[PDB]
Design a protein around this motif. Structure first.
Motif, PDB file in Angstrom:
ATOM      1  N   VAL A 146       0.859  -1.213   0.063  1.00 19.29           N
ATOM      2  CA  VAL A 146       0.116   0.107  -0.029  1.00 19.29           C
ATOM      3  C   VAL A 146       0.945   1.290  -0.019  1.00 19.29           C
ATOM      4  CG1 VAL A 146      -1.943   0.942   0.993  1.00 19.29           C
ATOM      5  CG2 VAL A 146      -1.425  -1.192   1.688  1.00 19.29           C
ATOM      6  N   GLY A 147       0.529   2.229  -0.658  1.00 22.00           N
ATOM      7  CA  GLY A 147       1.502   3.423  -0.676  1.00 22.00           C
ATOM      8  C   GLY A 147       0.830   4.758  -1.301  1.00 22.00           C
ATOM      9  N   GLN A 148       1.268   5.967  -0.976  1.00 25.17           N
ATOM     10  CA  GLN A 148       0.502   7.023  -1.717  1.00 25.17           C
ATOM     11  C   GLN A 148       1.408   7.360  -2.889  1.00 25.17           C
ATOM     12  OE1 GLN A 148      -1.939   8.738  -1.369  1.00 25.17           O
ATOM     13  NE2 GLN A 148      -1.445  10.943  -1.799  1.00 25.17           N
ATOM     14  N   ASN A 149       0.831   7.143  -4.039  1.00 23.40           N
ATOM     15  CA  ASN A 149       1.352   7.286  -5.332  1.00 23.40           C
ATOM     16  C   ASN A 149       2.597   6.628  -5.550  1.00 23.40           C
ATOM     17  OD1 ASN A 149       1.926   8.310  -7.859  1.00 23.40           O
ATOM     18  ND2 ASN A 149       3.073  10.299  -7.164  1.00 23.40           N
ATOM     19  N   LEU A 150       2.473   5.202  -5.686  1.00 20.78           N
ATOM     20  CA  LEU A 150       3.380   4.365  -5.828  1.00 20.78           C
ATOM     21  C   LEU A 150       4.184   4.177  -7.273  1.00 20.78           C
ATOM     22  CD1 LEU A 150       3.741   2.905  -3.373  1.00 20.78           C
ATOM     23  CD2 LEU A 150       2.097   1.234  -3.899  1.00 20.78           C
ATOM     24  N   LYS A 151       3.730   5.006  -8.075  1.00 22.00           N
ATOM     25  CA  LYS A 151       4.164   5.009  -9.398  1.00 22.00           C
ATOM     26  C   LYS A 151       5.695   5.924  -9.105  1.00 22.00           C
ATOM     27  CE  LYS A 151       3.468   8.737 -11.362  1.00 22.00           C
ATOM     28  NZ  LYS A 151       2.818  10.033 -11.960  1.00 22.00           N
ATOM     29  N   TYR A 152       5.717   6.811  -8.178  1.00 19.28           N
ATOM     30  CA  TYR A 152       7.037   7.380  -7.833  1.00 19.28           C
ATOM     31  C   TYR A 152       7.749   6.284  -7.419  1.00 19.28           C
ATOM     32  CZ  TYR A 152      10.135  10.462  -5.656  1.00 19.28           C
ATOM     33  OH  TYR A 152      11.605  10.963  -5.136  1.00 19.28           O
ATOM     34  N   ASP A 153       7.423   5.553  -6.172  1.00 18.02           N
ATOM     35  CA  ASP A 153       8.347   4.568  -5.610  1.00 18.02           C
ATOM     36  C   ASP A 153       8.871   3.338  -6.617  1.00 18.02           C
ATOM     37  OD1 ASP A 153       7.966   5.764  -2.584  1.00 18.02           O
ATOM     38  OD2 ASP A 153       6.027   5.344  -3.500  1.00 18.02           O
ATOM     39  N   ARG A 154       7.964   3.022  -7.280  1.00 21.96           N
ATOM     40  CA  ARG A 154       8.539   1.915  -8.206  1.00 21.96           C
ATOM     41  C   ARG A 154       9.694   2.504  -9.087  1.00 21.96           C
ATOM     42  NH1 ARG A 154       9.338   1.600 -13.496  1.00 21.96           N
ATOM     43  NH2 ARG A 154       9.449  -0.601 -13.981  1.00 21.96           N
TER      44      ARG A 154
END
Ligand SMILES: [Zn+2]
Ligand SMILES: [Zn+2]
Ligand SMILES: [Zn+2]
Ligand SMILES: [Zn+2]
Length: 601
Positions: free
Chosen positions: A94-102
């Protein structure tokens, strides 16, 4: 507040390993990264945060390097220990705006899998217009908790700190709180996302799977030739100087190209009718009205047009070239539009003039690297095809069915004449209706675009509805369900909430109704485009062909295809996009290629 007592700051392997073990058995866990930059391709990972349960979160600083920063687990060691968990598709994050972390993990050869929930998209699907879908707004709206803001720990302006400079514990409070809050937001939101299969479907099969594909698109970037962009700039400086001379020459003396100040005292003072032209704009444009005969307003038009386009694209684009990749990485926003469409900034690819020569020159600067070609795959008038389907009109449907130009086909029916004899004026009238219908435009507004009197527009609309009855029914049924249930849905279940539907306000409620008719068509295009991206990306991922999906603008997907693979690849993109999405709307994908985006476009 949040103190240093709430969350643990992991400074040793043993403790990290302990947490990893708990994380492996958690049902879902919030994951998050901290970096020294918003620029994804060049950001360095500074730290990672996890939340296993509400209130149980940790911050693992790996690259804080301020003066006397305490020992931390090295980025490399922390990543090799975390890698299996992050790469395990079975480990749900779960994450807030995972696009970034990926993307960040991808900077280290790590493929973030199990990208199950993104609270941003959770919030967006539940109600796109409820408000901002950033974590601070989210935490406050859903949890009445005000999160530590980035500015609170980093500062502001040029003197703002990058994460690696922030004290371990300060970084920790902020970081661990995000992870914690994200998990809570998920726990509040996920249950709600289930009360309705529509939004659930969209969230699950459209928004979530799109997360890593957007990351991949953004990170691939687009090749822009700075040289071409510069020549275009110089030339533009010349055309502006010439155009200004042409203005001065049409009148007397000098003046700025600013209406309601300089132009009124020139244009109408030399005959014409008193009201100016609001740059309100796409309905009332007295400058281009006069342009069909009067020369001056026509040059003031072309001048300003080139002036905007230069400062915006010709001058900005080259400055956006990333030194690390040598490419431009646009920022797609997945949770911003009311309709569900992807938007884009830095650069906003959608604001590049479509039907204009200069805009065309802008696209020429988007080039394919050596031995590759740009390939544009477009959904031909998808919004009009969606309406054909939503309105269940045999006429329109058959028009698309036998490959006829729906604008001429529409004109041939509205004006009642053979398809071969429909004139350009008729086709342009039928077109104005067709596209006027999508945006739910009133007969007066249609008159403003065709330059015909009101009621002549109405005469054209009634004739349209008579020849295309199902369109009115769809329009009446959508305004209806919008009032009854306060929202409209797309074919996939995506919802647009229309709060001002029973507004008791005039224009505000009118807008809500226009939105009611529009959103189902625009939203459905949005869903399809998203399904095609996921479909095409899956094939890219699985089959590893010599192609990169580089953009998504309006209703087209742009790629870089190797020159020797163009045919096989085009046959394949084409099939995926029009056969592996919705099997219900009559779809057509126009695939083109060239040395640059304009040629392929
Ligand atoms: Zn984050
Ligand atoms: Zn964070
Ligand atoms: Zn469209
Ligand atoms: Zn086909």
């Amino acid at each position: 507040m949040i103190s240093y007592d709430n969350y643990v700051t992991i400074l040793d392997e043993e403790t990290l390993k302990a947490w990893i073990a708990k994380l492996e058995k958690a049902p879902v866990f919030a994951f998050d990264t901290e970096t020294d930059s918003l620029d994804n391709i060049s950001a360095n990972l500074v730290g990672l945060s996890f939340a296993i349960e509400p209130g149980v979160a940790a911050y693992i600083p790996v690259a804080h390097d301020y003066l006397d920063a305490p020992d931390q687990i090295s980025r490399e060691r922390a990543l090799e220990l975390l890698k299996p968990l992050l790469e395990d598709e079975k480990a749900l994050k779960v994450g807030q705006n995972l696009k970034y972390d990926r993307g960040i993990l991808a900077n280290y050869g790590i493929e973030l899998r199990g990208i199950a929930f993104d609270t941003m998209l959770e919030s967006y699907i539940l109600n796109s217009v409820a408000g901002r879908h950033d974590m601070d707004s989210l935490a406050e709206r859903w949890l009445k908790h005000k999160t530590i803001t980035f500015e609170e720990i980093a500062g502001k302006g040029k003197n703002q700190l990058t994460f690696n400079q922030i004290a371990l514990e300060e970084a920790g409070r902020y970081a661990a709180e995000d992870a914690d809050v994200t998990l809570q937001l998920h726990l509040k939101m996920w249950p709600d996302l289930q009360k309705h299969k529509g939004p659930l479907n969209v969230f699950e099969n459209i928004e979530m799977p799109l997360v890593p594909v957007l990351s991949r698109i953004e990170r691939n970037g687009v090749k822009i030739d700075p040289k071409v962009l510069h020549n275009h700039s110089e030339e533009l400086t010349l055309r502006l100087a010439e155009l200004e001379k042409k203005a001065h020459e049409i009148a007397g003396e000098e003046f700025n190209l600013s209406s309601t100040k300089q132009l009124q005292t020139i244009l109408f003072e030399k005959q014409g009718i008193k009201p100016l032209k609001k740059t309100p704009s796409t309905s009332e444009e007295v400058l281009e009205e006069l342009a069909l005969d009067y020369p001056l307003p026509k040059v003031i038009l072309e001048y300003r047009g080139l002036a905007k386009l230069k400062s915006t694209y010709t001058d900005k684009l080259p400055l956006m070239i990333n030194p690390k990749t040598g490419r431009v990485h646009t920022s797609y926003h997945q949770a911003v539009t009311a309709t569900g469409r992807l938007s884009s900034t830095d650069p906003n690819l959608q604001n590049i003039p479509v039907r204009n020569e200069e805009g065309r020159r802008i696209r020429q600067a988007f080039i394919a690297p050596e031995d590759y070609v740009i390939v544009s795959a477009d959904y031909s008038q998808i919004e009009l095809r969606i309406m054909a389907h939503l309105s269940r009109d045999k006429g329109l449907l058959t028009a698309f069915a036998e490959g006829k130009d729906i604008h001429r086909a529409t004109a041939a029916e509205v004006f009642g004449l053979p398809l071969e004899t429909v004139t350009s004026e008729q086709r342009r009238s039928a077109k104005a209706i067709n596209f006027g219908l999508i945006y739910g435009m009133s007969a007066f507004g249609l008159a403003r675009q065709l330059n015909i009197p009101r009621k002549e527009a109405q005469k054209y609309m009634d004739l349209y509805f008579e020849r295309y009855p199902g369109v009115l029914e769809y329009m009446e049924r959508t305004r209806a369900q919008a009032k009854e249930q306060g929202y409209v849905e797309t074919l996939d279940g995506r919802r647009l909430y229309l709060p001002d539907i029973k507004s008791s306000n005039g224009a505000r409620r009118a807008a809500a109704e226009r939105a009611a008719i529009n959103a189902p068509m625009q939203g459905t295009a949005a869903d399809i485009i998203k399904r095609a991206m996921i479909a095409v990306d899956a094939w890219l991922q699985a089959e590893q062909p010599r192609v990169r999906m580089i953009m998504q603008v309006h209703d087209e997907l742009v790629f870089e295809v190797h020159k020797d693979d163009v045919d096989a690849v085009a046959k394949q993109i084409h099939q995926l996009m029009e056969n592996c999405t919705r099997l219900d709307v009559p779809l057509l994908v126009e695939v083109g290629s060239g040395e640059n985006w304009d040629q392929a476009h």
